[PDB]
Amino acid sequence: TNRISRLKTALFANTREISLERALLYTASHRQTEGEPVILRRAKATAYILEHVEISIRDEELIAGNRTVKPRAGIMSPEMDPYWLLKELDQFPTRPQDRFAISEEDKRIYREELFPYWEKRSMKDFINGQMTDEVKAATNTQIFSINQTDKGQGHIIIDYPRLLNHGLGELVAQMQQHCQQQPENHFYQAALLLLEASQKHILRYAELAETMAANCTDAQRREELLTIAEISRHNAQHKPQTFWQACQLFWYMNIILQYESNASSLSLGRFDQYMLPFYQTSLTQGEDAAFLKELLESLWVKCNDIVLLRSTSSARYFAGFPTGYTALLGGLTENGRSAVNVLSFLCLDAYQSVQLPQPNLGVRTNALIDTPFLMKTAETIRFGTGIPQIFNDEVVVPAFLNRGVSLEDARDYSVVGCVELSIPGRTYGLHDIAMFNLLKVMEICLHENEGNAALTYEGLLEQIRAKISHYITLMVEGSNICDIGHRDWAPVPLLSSFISDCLEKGRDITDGGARYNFSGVQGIGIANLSDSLHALKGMVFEQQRLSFDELLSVLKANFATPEGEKVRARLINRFEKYGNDIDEVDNISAELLRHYCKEVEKYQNPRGGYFTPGSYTVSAHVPLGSVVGATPDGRFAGEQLADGGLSPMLGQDAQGPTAVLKSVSKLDNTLLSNGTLLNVKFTPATLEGEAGLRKLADFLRAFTQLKLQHIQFNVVNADTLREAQQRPQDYAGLVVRVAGYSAFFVELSKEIQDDIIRRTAHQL
Numbered sequence: 208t209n210r211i212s213r214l215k216t217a218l219f220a221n222t223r224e225i226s227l228e229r230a231l232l233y234t235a236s237h238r239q240t241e242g243e244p245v246i247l248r249r250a251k252a253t254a255y256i257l258e259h260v261e262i263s264i265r266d267e268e269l270i271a272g273n274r275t276v277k278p279r280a281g282i283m284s285p286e287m288d289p290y291w292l293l294k295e296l297d298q299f300p301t302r303p304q305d306r307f308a309i310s311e312e313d314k315r316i317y318r319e320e321l322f323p324y325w326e327k328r329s330m331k332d333f334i335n336g337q338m339t340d341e342v343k344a345a346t347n348t349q350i351f352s353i354n355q356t357d358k359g360q361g362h363i364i365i366d367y368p369r370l371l372n373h374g375l376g377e378l379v380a381q382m383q384q385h386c387q388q389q390p391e392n393h394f395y396q397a398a399l400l401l402l403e404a405s406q407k408h409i410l411r412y413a414e415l416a417e418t419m420a421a422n423c424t425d426a427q428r429r430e431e432l433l434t435i436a437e438i439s440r441h442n443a444q445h446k447p448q449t450f451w452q453a454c455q456l457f458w459y460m461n462i463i464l465q466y467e468s469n470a471s472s473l474s475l476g477r478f479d480q481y482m483l484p485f486y487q488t489s490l491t492q493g494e495d496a497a498f499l500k501e502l503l504e505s506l507w508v509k510c511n512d513i514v515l516l517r518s519t520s521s522a523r524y525f526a527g528f529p530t531g532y533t534a535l536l537g538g539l540t541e542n543g544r545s546a547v548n549v550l551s552f553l554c555l556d557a558y559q560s561v562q563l564p565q566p567n568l569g570v571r572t573n574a575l576i577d578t579p580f581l582m583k584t585a586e587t588i589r590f591g592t593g594i595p596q597i598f599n600d601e602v603v604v605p606a607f608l609n610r611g612v613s614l615e616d617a618r619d620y621s622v623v624g625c626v627e628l629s630i631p632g633r634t635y636g637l638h639d640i641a642m643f644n645l646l647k648v649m650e651i652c653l654h655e656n657e658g659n660a661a662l663t664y665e666g667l668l669e670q671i672r673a674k675i676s677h678y679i680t681l682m683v684e685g686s687n688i689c690d691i692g693h694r695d696w697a698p699v700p701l702l703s704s705f706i707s708d709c710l711e712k713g714r715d716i717t718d719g720g721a722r723y724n725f726s727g728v729q730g731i732g733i734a735n736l737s738d739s740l741h742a743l744k745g746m747v748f749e750q751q752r753l754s755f756d757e758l759l760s761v762l763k764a765n766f767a768t769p770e771g772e773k774v775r776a777r778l779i780n781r782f783e784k785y786g787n788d789i790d791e792v793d794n795i796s797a798e799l800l801r802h803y804c805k806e807v808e809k810y811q812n813p814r815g816g817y818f819t820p821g822s823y824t825v826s827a828h829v830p831l832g833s834v835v836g837a838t839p840d841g842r843f844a845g846e847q848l849a850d851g852g853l854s855p856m857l858g859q860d861a862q863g864p865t866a867v868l869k870s871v872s873k874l875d876n877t878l879l880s881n882g883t884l885l886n887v888k889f890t891p892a893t894l895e896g897e898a899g900l901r902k903l904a905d906f907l908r909a910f911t912q913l914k915l916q917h918i919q920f921n922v923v924n925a926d927t928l929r930e931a932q933q934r935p936q937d938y939a940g941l942v943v944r945v946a947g948y949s950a951f952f953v954e955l956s957k958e959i960q961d962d963i964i965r966r967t968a969h970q971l
Contacts, residue, residue, distance in 0.1 A: 208501055210267050211560055214508045217265060218278045219939070223514070225299060225309040226280035229469060230321055232256045233286060246698045246715060250397035253467045253701065254404040260466070264416060264435065267428070269505045270455055271412045271435050272462040273512050281307040281516035284469050285321045287697070288331035288357035291518040293322050304522035304956050305514075330696040331357050337688045345681040348651065349834040351643045352827075353685040357518065360693050361470025361531075362623050362639055363716070365705035366632025367481045370460055371453050374446030375406050378704075385710060392713050394720075397700035401467070405701070406443045409459050413439035449492070450499050453485035454506050467701050471515045472531030472624035472638070475566065476631035479536045479550035486550055503557040510565035523830040524642070526959055527950030530565055531624040537580060538571030539600055539618040545575040552580065555587045555595065562592050564942060564949040569622055572911045573600035578904065585903035588920050589894045593944025596626075596919035599911055603628055606880040606916070610819065612723060625947020626823045626852075626882040626917050627727055633707045635721035635814065638881060639729070640686045642824075644831045645803070646732035646848055648674050649739060650838060657759050664748040668740070671799070676806050679728075683810040683818060686726050690813055693717050717814075724816030727881035730803040731824050731831055733874075734785045734849035734856045737796035738840035742782035746839065752777070762837040765844045779841035779859075786855025788866040793873045804878040821881030823852035824946045829958050850962055851946045852884035853915075857965045864889075864969040865909060872913040879916065884947050886966060888921040893970040902971040919944055921963065928952065928964045 236255035240248040263276045274282060281299075283292055296314050299307045326332075334356045346352060355361075370378070382399040389395055416436035423429040438455050447453035464473055489499055514528040536551040551570075558568055570584045587595055600618075606628065607617035616630050623629040627638035652671045656662050694717040702716065703709040709720030746752050753761070753774065761768070766775040783789040785796050800822065807820040824831075832847035840856065849856040853871050860867050864887055871885055894903055910918050921944045931938035935953035943952045943963050952960060 208504070208560075211501065211504045211508065214267055214505060215511075215561065215563065218508065218511055221278065222308045223279045223281060223306075224277055225307045225313060225516070226275050226277070226282050227313050227316055227321065228260060228275060229256060229282050229466065230285050231316070232259050234321060234324055237286075244393045245696070246393045246397050246700055249467075249698055250401050250700050253401055253463075256466045257404045257408040257463065262411060262415065264412070264419060264432070269431065269435070269502050270458050270509050271416065271439065272459050273509070274462055274465050278512050279514045281514065282469055283317075283516055284358055285317075285325040286329055287359065289322050289325040289329050290331065291357065292317065295519060298519070302519045302522075304519065304526045305517065305528065307516070330692050333696055334689055334692040337692065339684065339688075342681050342685040342688070345678055346685070349644055349647050349831075350651070350678045351641055351682045351685070352524070353641050353689055354639050356689050356692065357521070358515070359468040359470030359697065360637070360699075361468055362472045362627065362637065363635060363702065363706070364474045364476040364621055364623060364629055364631040365464070365702060366707060367457065367476055369632065369705055371447055371456065371481060371485070374444060374456070375402055375442070376444035377446065378402055379406070382704065389713060394698075394700055394703065394709070394713060394715050398704035401701035402704070405460065405463050408463060409439050409443045412459070413443065447485055448488055449494070450482070450485045450489040451502060453482055454502060458506065458509055464702055465513065468699055471525075471529065472533070472627075474531050474621065474623045474629075475534040476621045477536075477538065477619070478534040479548060479554055480546060483548050483550050486553075500553060500557055503553060504560045507557055507561040507563065507566055511563045513565075524825060524827040526826040527945060527948075527955050528564065529625060529825055529945070529948035529950075531567060531948065532565045533567040533569060533622050533624060535569040535571050535598065535621045536595070537576065539573060539575075539604070541615050541618060543618060545573070545577065546571075547577060547580045552583055555583050558594060559587055559590060562590055562942065564592070564951070567625075567948055568595040569598050570595045571598050571600050572907060574911065576911070581904040581907060582900050585900040585907070588903065589891075589900070589922055591891070591922040592942040593919055593921060593949040596917065596947070597907060597910065598622060598626075598628075598917050599915055601911060602876050602914040602916050606877050609877060610723070610725070610880050616722075622882065625825055626884045627821065628880060628882040628916075630723055632705060633722040634725070635706065635716040636723070636725040636727050636819070636881065637686065637690060637812070638725070638727040639825075640689060640726050641682050641728045642827050642831070643679070643682055643728060643730050643803070644732060644835070644848075645675070645730055645799070646735045646739070646835045646838060647831070648678060649736055650835050653762070654759060657756060659755070662755055664744050672802050675799075675803060679803070679806045680810070682728055686728060686818070687813055690726065694813070719814035721814070724812060724814035725819045725881065726812040726816070727819050727821050728807055729821045729823055729852070729881070730800060731822070731828060731852065732848040733796045733800050733822060734854065734859070735838060735840050735842060736799055737785045737792050738782075738856060738859065739838045740795050741792040742778045742841070743839040745782050746778060758839065762839070765837045775841050778839055784840070784855065784859035784861075786860035786867045786870045787862040788869040790873070793870045796870075797874045801875045801878065804875065808878070819881040820879055821852075821883060822879055823882060823884035824848070824850065825948070826945055826959055828946075829962065847958065847962055850966065851886040854884075854886045854966075857962070858967055860967050864906065864971065868910055868913050868915060871915050876914060876916050883916045885915060885918045886921070886944065886946060887918060888923070888966045888968050890968045890970060891922055891924060894922060899971075906971055919947070921966065925964050925968060928960065932957075932960060
């Protein structure tokens, strides 16, 4: 509809700005709460923000509530890390990734007020002081990186049924009982005051809407504002009844949760499941189905107001705003039957009207998925934004059962962020706490064996396994340090009050209140690792075309010599690559990634749970590849690693898209319980017509039966992407799939753009 087009346009009409507002309000509260327990200072800061932040209802909005009045603000968190903000203060409009405007006045405020206050007392300060010599040395080798040391943790889904099936009034009454039973418990005290502050913040909007209504001279908009006002008064206390009431309470708490956390991937869970009762009530009470769809389209637009601020180095790993308002559709019911419902379809139809990076919708596939929903899924994929992605119940549920998750909890899974498997309202997974550079481990092993006359292939392999094991230990150490930094500096009591089993245990998620406690660490580069070892085994040890030392010399020269460029061609073309259903190379990727997985699961986090392995990248395959020299798969020095996590390396998949599925199916995907990621690209031509949709639907059934965890699709011609590079001013709205998230192509750095362009465009 035209309103929806105008709401979308308004998000991008003005240049994104850095916002100091949360930091100034958070700091003002902090000045008044000196000497109080950290969790109460955190809560009172959120309450202070809720009472003082500037709010508006933007033109034609049907769902009230935005973090900032100006759209898509970069909300800075100097309480988490004030140092990078200071360094980049005069570089925000020009930095290579994620630009923002910032006024001269706000820069002065940052230099004069916020930086001096937070210097030496920030979370980054604590984490810096805890980082041990061995871990800092290990991050200097580029073998792994530790995430969220400088920002809110996020990466969690709250219990939406708890919120929507009770309403804030009953939740306050239950928290009052907890505080009465345990009057010394600061978590309960904090959660109560935040529930109460949430009510007042909702009533701030109720009062504003009622005022705006009287000052509105359009009769249709007046009625809309009066309804927003009435719904907001209802939201302050009552459990929702109608779809609009549920969506509005839902969105108010999501904004409020961003005030508490200011973090990525506060994901949405199984929206089509927990919203179904309210959609059904609205229909049976006679509301207009077209308005309900327009309301949902408007809610999708609301999700795109939120972009997270990160440093220039961080933006190399997480480029183009992977906000992670991820909602999954379909799946299984409690007894293992199909959960597809009318909202599963409507969510996809509303997305087809919006076609923005958010919500990051996913479809849960399984052996029961019906052809109409499969074809609606295929139809939506063909629009080319990358959404929806696909998750496979057939392997995700056993992966969770292996981690001690109950059958009913596992069947109720959803996804945090890009691809991180999680149990909604029941999990604190630290789902992207570290990324492990498998190819760098291999590269260091290679050069450690220069001049080793006794080297054999199997001995090299044992050295690689041993160095993987050694550095996993240090990853764990660094990850636990950041875990503790979030516990000591940044509890999230309101969020935690919506996470089982925090209220029962009486503890925030950062101190282990969640039912399930993981730490999720990503092994990246498996395609390059297996390709490299297979070509090296054949080139050097089997055929003896070069000695090992002669190969090392060619790598150090970056293949530049005349014989070097010819050795490179032989490595690339005369040895099989992962992603072509070739067992001899695929079995290397399976073996080495299983070794990674079995080592990771040995280690405990400080919350009474264990580390879990994943294999996904966001955009980190580019900076991780940028620190690995030339390798025996034919990579030049600095070249990206394979995209996504489980994808073949660029252009190496020569046997079609089903051969890719079969290679990935050989990995032990049940162990990779933190989630995995596979990118596949199709030409728009191969998907044309109903026959094109049926081909895609059949491909998705093949994917399901092969028990891969995840797949997602670009559908775009390389010519379009090159044209957007030449004339970005004509392609500001072009959306592409990066890795578990979608982004505006012209806002991605050249190296990510070329990643997407160079991925194989498959036919079906």
